[PDB]
Design a protein around this ligand. Structure first.
Ligand SMILES: CC(=O)N[C@@H]1[C@@H](O[C@@H]2O[C@H](CO)[C@H](O)[C@H](O)[C@H]2O)[C@H](O)[C@@H](CO)O[C@H]1O
Length: 162
């Protein structure tokens, strides 16, 4: 179809390897939840502009959790909350401060890639897993699909907008 394929409505699916999923967050709270139920749990939480430090509730992987959040920018903030085993408390692994409200997740090269840092200079980073194929995602906002070969385009969107 189009190289920027979408938008698609919120759903749950197992992303194929080699394709960036670009999610256009349009509200606060949980953007997506992704797990293989074995060694990888990531949830992305959206925090609106100028939020003083506070503990908010988020339902993730079916359970209500309290996360400490803040955002001292005009830009939107996206926190990666992770755990690698079912018994561990989630920790804030990475952040993305963004004027464009776009977050990205990719299966490639054996590991999960996401964007982090601050637009317009956000960059990618990897996360290891021993069960990449098992990782599914529940996405709560509209999203697009872009091949990994076209990451330069994905990077422009993340940093500069659609
Ligand atoms: C060195 C390399 O090829 N790394 C790949 C990643 O792409 C790089 O991403 C940085 C930002 O993090 C720069 O844009 C650099 O030019 C890119 O080469 C890529 O994000 C991941 C996932 O597709 O694959 C790495 O191999």
């Amino acid at each position: 179809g189009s190289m920027l394929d979408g938008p698609y409505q919120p759903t749950t699916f197992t992303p194929p390897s080699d394709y960036w999923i670009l999610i256009n967050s349009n509200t606060n709270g949980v953007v997506y939840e992704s797990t293989n139920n074995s060694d990888f749990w990531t949830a992305v939480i959206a925090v609106e502009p100028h939020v003083d430090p506070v503990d908010r509730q988020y339902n993730v992987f079916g359970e209500n959790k309290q996360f400490n959040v803040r955002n001292d920018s005009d830009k939107w903030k996206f926190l990666e909350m992770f755990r690698g085993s079912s018994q561990n408390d989630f920790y804030n692994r990475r952040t993305l401060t963004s004027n464009t409200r776009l977050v990205g997740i990719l299966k490639y090269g054996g590991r999960i890639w996401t964007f982090h840092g601050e637009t317009p200079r956000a960059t990618t980073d990897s996360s290891n897993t021993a069960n990449l194929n098992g990782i599914s995602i529940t996405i709560h906002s509209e999203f697009y699909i872009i091949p990994r070969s076209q990451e330069s385009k994905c990077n422009e969107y993340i940093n500069n907008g659609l």
